[PDB]
């Protein structure tokens, strides 16, 4: 109750850290792949298209990398054990991209970077 009320806006803190000129989290594991994949955001195997890089999920998850509890139900990670596709233009900061962007529940593409359900 009081422990939950205090907790720690880690997603908000990372955006402020970058705004202050902080160097983005490194050592995100980039995978070798064909780059002829579906282009969906989070997949069981690398699915990067010609405009994306595929990375090991756990290495791009702020919560996994910082050893802090996950917000998702019962601390369930959505990247661990999977592969996340990141636009080549934003591959310099995969942790920042996954936090600031959200996946479309219909086509499985990143909203604003592949989803065209409109």
């Amino acid at each position: 109750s009081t422990v939950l009320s205090f907790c720690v806006d880690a997603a908000k803190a990372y955006k402020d850290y970058l705004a202050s000129g902080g160097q983005p989290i490194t050592n995100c594991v980039k995978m070798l792949c064909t780059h002829t994949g579906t282009g969906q955001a989070i997949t069981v195997t690398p699915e990067a298209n010609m405009d994306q890089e595929s990375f090991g999920g756990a290495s791009c998850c702020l919560y996994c990398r910082c050893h802090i509890d996950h917000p998702n139900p019962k601390g369930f990670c959505d990247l661990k054990g999977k592969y996340v596709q990141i636009p080549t233009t934003c591959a310099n900061d995969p942790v920042g991209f996954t936090l600031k962007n959200t996946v479309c529940t219909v086509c499985g593409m990143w909203k604003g970077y592949g989803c065209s359900c409109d």
Binding site: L32, C33, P46, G56, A58
Partner: protein
């Protein structure tokens, strides 16, 4: 330029395995040279990708609900590049467990932190990958003798927890090696020492046991076979190459649906051994996979 440059790496030729060399100091012409990797790709992602590309050419058993354990999976970066490559390579749904002396975050289904000697399991495994390396190996003060440490655990883990038909890939170097491990290679249908092309400038190799038979097929003297390995490396320079990393179209391990059966030690006849030797049979029960990490209780 060399033909082997388009391969993921180079395996120890059979004639070098049949020699009786004395151990010599390893002296590589290109020692330490770094490979030219694709932009932003880590050395360990490239290395495991080439190991997996080579494993795709062997008769590996690939059963439904395959079980794979990866020792020495943590890096000084706090992540598991090799585990990410194994999970990309293995069929979806493959149970993948990894472990390391040091904490790290992984894509594996379960991760155990601590010395590999603290890892227990009643379950048998289909594939064992080890990248363990003792940093103290760099302190070459004495003669290059067989090393114990995690190697005694790996040998016992193979003899007790590897399913018949299963395979292993255990990392060795000039000084990080074990005679009993080489002797165990004679308990597989086939074996080799495989050198990744991205690490051609290192004495590193993966000792690969293909299709475990649970009995000696050939007698191997470990002290002689490691001397043979160093002689091969000292007389066969390998050109650094990352060419195989650019073609990932056939990368995923082919799902073979390999039969899984339970058999007493008296049911292992020549006909069963023949199926094990072709990657068409795995012998173990299909019970729940349970692992544990021994915790030492102190004040």
């Amino acid at each position: 330029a060399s033909s082997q440059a388009w391969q993921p790496g180079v395996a120890m030729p059979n004639l070098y395995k049949m020699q009786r060399m004395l151990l010599e100091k390893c002296d590589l012409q290109n020692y330490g040279d770094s490979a030219t990797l694709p932009k932003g790709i880590m050395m360990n992602v490239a290395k495991y990708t080439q190991l997996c590309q080579y494993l795709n050419t062997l008769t590996l058993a690939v059963p439904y609900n395959m079980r794979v354990i990866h020792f020495g999976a943590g890096s000084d970066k706090g992540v598991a590049p090799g585990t990410a490559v194994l999970r990309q390579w293995l069929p979806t749904g493959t149970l993948l467990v990894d472990s390391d002396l040091n904490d790290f975050v992984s894509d594996a289904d379960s991760t155990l932190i601590g010395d590999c000697a603290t890892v227990h399991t009643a379950n048998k495994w289909d594939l064992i990958i080890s990248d363990m390396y003792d940093p103290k190996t760099k302190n070459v003060t004495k003669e290059n003798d067989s090393k114990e440490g995690f190697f005694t655990y790996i040998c016992g883990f193979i003899q007790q927890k590897l399913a018949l038909g299963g395979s292993v890939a255990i990392k060795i170097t000039e000084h990080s090696w074990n005679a009993d491990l080489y002797k165990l290679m004679g308990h597989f249908a086939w074996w080799t020492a495989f050198v990744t092309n991205v690490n051609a400038s290192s004495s590193e190799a993966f000792l690969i046991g293909c299709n475990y038979l649970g009995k000696p097929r050939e007698q191997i003297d470990g002290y002689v076979m490691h001397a043979n390995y160093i002689f091969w490396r000292n007389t066969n320079p390998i050109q650094l190459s990352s060419y195989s990393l650019f073609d990932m179209s056939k990368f995923p391990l082919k799902l073979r649906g390999t039969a899984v059966m339970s058999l007493k030690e008296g049911q292992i006849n020549d006909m069963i051994l023949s199926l094990l030797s072709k990657g068409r049979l795995i012998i173990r029960e299909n019970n729940r996979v349970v692992i544990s990490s021994d915790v030492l209780v102190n004040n």
